[PDB]
Amino acid sequence: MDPREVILCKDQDGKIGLRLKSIDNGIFVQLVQANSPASLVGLRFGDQVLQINGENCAGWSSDKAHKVLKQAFGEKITMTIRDRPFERTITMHKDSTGHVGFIFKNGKITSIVKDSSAARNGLLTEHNICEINGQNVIGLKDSQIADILSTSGTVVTITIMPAF
């Protein structure tokens, strides 16, 4: 529930491996480069950034957010973070055919199949799929996500977020 603090190191160009987005007058993590300092401190897609070096992010554009990181003084950048405020978890059961009951494309749920476990469990469309049974699927291709779902046993537990 509460915000955690993270401390990251810059590279030479002053980067941490992070793209940010403006949403409802907050700032959110949109992309996290592999093997970056951002990645190492556990920042993910959907995390809200409340502060960068004690300075409030409220009302900032993403262009302003990035500028503040690039021009930050010293070797360490501190951020105050709220872990994915929008994330929910849904558990479904595959039926006889081995399906839970939804259509997806580009990591977003686009349709709920009638009277499937996804239907019973109130899975919503226009929602990105973040994790499936522990496995993060952000930045993966649809085929890798469909294969994760295939070799899954019966219980399929996904975390989702509204696309926003």
């Binding site: 399906h99 259509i103 649809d142």
Partner: peptide
């Protein structure tokens, strides 16, 4: 493409 799953 899509993936019914």
């Amino acid at each position: 493409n899509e993936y019914y799953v």
